[PDB]
Every structure is written in structure tokens, then in C-alpha cells.
A = this chain, B = another copy of it.
Amino acid sequence: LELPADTVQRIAAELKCHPTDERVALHLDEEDKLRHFRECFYIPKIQDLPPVDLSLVNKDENAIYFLGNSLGLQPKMVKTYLEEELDKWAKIAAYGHEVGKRPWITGDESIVGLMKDIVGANEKEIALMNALTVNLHLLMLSFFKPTPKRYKILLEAKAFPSDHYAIESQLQLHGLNIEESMRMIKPREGEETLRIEDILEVIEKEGDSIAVILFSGVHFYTGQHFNIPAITKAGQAKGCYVGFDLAHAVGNVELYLHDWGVDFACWCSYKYLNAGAGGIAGAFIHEKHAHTIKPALVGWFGHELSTRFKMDNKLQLIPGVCGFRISNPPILLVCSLHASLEIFKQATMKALRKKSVLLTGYLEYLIKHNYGVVNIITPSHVEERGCQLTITFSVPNKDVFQELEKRGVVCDKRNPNGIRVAPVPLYNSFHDVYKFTNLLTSILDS
């Protein structure tokens, strides 16, 4: 299978231009079978962005939005989907709990089918509920059951703060010494990312004492995409449960949670899944646990639908992850997520991931060619990253982030002088990447 760099160079040869020519980007966009999906989203205009310097930009041009890994752009249909439910609420009020396209009682279940291909799990293995870190806790209350022999939680060092705090509070709940019980894998000296061989070594050596491995699927800062099946198998070989925070993985990289035998997972919906700030989150528990791992905290929405409304206070618990669902689901959040998931249905993760490899590969190619001063922290192997590249710079005189945002590039900063950029296949183009790299080159040359 042709690597992105090789595709770019071959296309350039065919076009009779240099691989760094704008025509290469324009051609890749012409050949992009997912090109039309860009029209499904509200893309901000450059002139409308708060930090933009109008004197450096062309009005009425679209922003170069590379922050879809943090706050995904809005599907145009969100309003329409919300209107369907507001209209029902206006027309029949309480009766909307039981009737319509999204009966409110089963609003979550009405759209969960659309998640099956995204995470690679069955409908009974997925719940759409609450918020990401909330779900992490609900799952950990059941999966983390420390003993004198097996009490550790294994995670990456410099994990996302919410997960870090969640794990710390879980350990504190059991009166466990944090320094001794919170095992955090640090990179080798002079590296920011983890080597799979090093992770597996820790698991092999310390696995007997580890109750739960809780890793990110994709690391938020380095952009490293961890080998989920390998970590899962290694942990399970030592008797650990293995779960993942897939905040940066879902809707980005392909996932097969069931087939890989992942024990549990959770994710948010407002990043690659484009559902809007604080949107309804997700949880997965492998069906193999449905009768053995029970919810720690129960509410009425974990009671089987068939008898729930008898209200006789005789719990009939739904097996598997839906037993962990505590409260009635927020229809308005279901609406916005639904609009997004219909788009994913049409695009397919297979096709999206294929475009992402070429799109991020093209970005990497242009960066490496022009400045090979500029360091890509994200792993170079195509299977070891998603959309996002994390880049650092060595320019004492320039704040590269500030100069980019003034010009309508929307991305994330980390210190001292670096950036997170994540071109996404649904609504970013190869031309976006071309434009970005030329703005960057111009900034670095002063």
C-alpha cells in the first residue's frame, strides 16, 4: 500500500509539477470522493474569528479550521433535528415520551445503531449517556475492585487532567496510597511519546499487581495513537481489565472494541463526533461482562423498559452497559449527535480514515520538505497517529501560534513554542493543508 509521501510525489509527476505545487492539493481535492461532505458543515469565515487581524487576511475566505479534534464544526442539520423535537414538545408535550422518530424515553437507543460501525460494537454494548468523565467514573466503580495483591491502575504519564483526577479520586475512594497505586508510564529521556515495547514490558513485569489499565486511545497532546488491541491482550494475559478513554479516537481512527475484546471504554461526542459543546457522551462494555460486571450506581433507567413504569420499586436490571444508565436521556443532546451520526453513516469510517491518512500524510510531507527548526512530535508511522499532528518550533523571535491565529488558522497551542493541528476528513481539504503550510513557511521565514 502506497505511503502518502509516495502518492503526493507520483501525483506531482503525473501533473508535471513539483510535489509542493498548489496544483497537487487541488488535484487531491478533485479526486476526494468525500469532498461533498464539506458542504454539510458550517465553516467559520476568517473575518469573524476573534483573534484575526483583518489587514493580514482576505475577507469572505473560509477559516482554516484545524481544531476539529477539540470542538468539531456544526452539522448544518442540527437545527432541523432540534426543531423536530421542539415541534413535538409544542404539539403533544408529555406524549412525546412514547411517540415519534425519537420517543424521548428511548431517545438514546433510537440512535445508538449509528454508533455500531464507529466503535465496532453491538447495540447492547453501547450506551449514549451523561458526559465523558462521568461515564469513566461509572465504569471504574464497577471494574476497579482492588485487593491486597492486585490494586494498581496503569495509565500514561501526563494523561488528560480529567482522567488523571478521576483515577486519583477512584484510588482515594479505596484509601489507596496514590504514589504506590497510580502507575504512570513515562517516556524515555529525550522523547515525548511512548514505545509500545516499553508499555508491554511494564505490563509483563507489573501486570499481576494491576487491577485496571486505563489508557487513552489517542493521546490528546502528543497525538500518539496507541495499539489498542496489543495493550488489551497484554493486560488481559496478566489478569488486568483494560479500558480506554477514546475521546480523541472515536470518529478519528477505526475501532473494533468488541472484536479486540476491550473490556470497557468511554468517549465524548463534541470532538471528532461534532455534536456540540458538552454533548451527550458514550460508554462501551464488552458483552462478555453482561452478567458478571454489575453497575455500582443504579437509577430507574437501568431498569428494563417493559416494567420500568410500573414503579413497583422491584429492580429488573438490564444486562450490560444499559444497566449503568441512571437517568432519562436528554433529547436535545440526542438531536445534535444524531445530525452528526447520519453524516458519519454516509461517509463511513473506512473512507474517512483513508482520507485522513493521505491528508495528514500530505501535511507531514509539506512540513518535512520545507523544514527538514520544525519538529513533529507525533509518531511518523501512519498507523500510530490519527488526524492530529503536534509540532514544536525553535524560533526565539516568533510566537508561531499567535501569528497563525491572526491569519485565520484555528488550532491549539502548547508551550514553549508549539501547536496541535488536526485536519479532519469530513470538512477539511487538501487545499486547507496547502494554505496552512504556506502561511507557516511565511511566518518562520519572518
Question: What residues make up the interface of A, taking CB atoms closer than 8 Å to B?
Answer: 42, 44-45, 48-50, 63, 65, 67, 70-71, 73-74, 78-79, 82-83, 85-86, 89-97, 99, 104, 107, 130-134, 136-137, 158-162, 164-166, 168-170, 173, 276-281, 295-303, 308, 311-313, 315, 326-333, 335-336, 410
Contacts and interface: CB of A to CB of B under 8 A. Distances in A.
Contact of A279 (B82, B97, B330): B330
Contact of A330 (B79, B280, B299): B280
A59 to B, nearest CB: 15
Contact of A300 (B70, B93, B95, B133): B133
Given A42-B90, A332-B336, 19 more contacts: A42-B89, A42-B91, A44-B93, A45-B91, A71-B94, A74-B93, A82-B332, A130-B134, A160-B311, A161-B303, A161-B312, A161-B313, A162-B299, A165-B300, A168-B315, A169-B296, A169-B297, A169-B298, A276-B332
A127 to B, nearest CB: 13
A133 B327 contact: yes
Contacts of A326: 131, 133-134, 137, 162, 166
Given A48-B91, A93-B65, A277-B97, A298 B328 contact: no
Contact of A328 (B48, B131, B136, B315): B131
B48 A134 contact: no
24 contacts: A44-B90, A44-B91, A44-B93, A48-B91, A50-B95, A63-B93, A67-B93, A74-B86, A82-B86, A89-B276, A95-B410, A130-B327, A137-B299, A160-B300, A161-B303, A161-B311, A162-B300, A162-B326, A165-B298, A169-B295, A169-B297, A278-B329, A278-B330, A279-B332
Nearest to A332: B332
A42 to B, nearest CB: 4
A166 B260 CA distance: 33
A224 to B, nearest CB: 16
A331 B67 CA distance: 19
Contacts of A168: 298, 315
B49 A159 contact: no
A30 B336 CA distance: 42
Nearest to A99: B50
A168 B13 CA distance: 70
Given A74-B93, A134-B134, A173 B296 contact: yes
Contacts of A79: 82-83, 86
A136 B335 CA distance: 26
Contacts of A327: 130-134, 162, 278, 281
Nearest to A311: B161
A327 B237 CA distance: 33
A71 B92 contact: no
Contacts of A161: 300, 303, 308, 311-313
B50 A104 contact: no
Contacts of A280: 330
A313 B329 CA distance: 31
Contacts of A165: 298-300, 302-303, 313, 315
Contacts of A83: 79
Contacts of A299: 133-134, 136-137, 162, 165-166
Contacts of A97: 71, 277
For A93, A160, A308, which residue has the most chain B Cβ atoms within 10 angstroms?
A93
Contacts of A298: 165-166, 168-169
Contacts of A82: 79, 82, 86, 332
A276 B331 contact: yes
B328 A92 contact: no
Contact of A74 (B49, B74, B89, B162): B89
A278 B73 contact: no
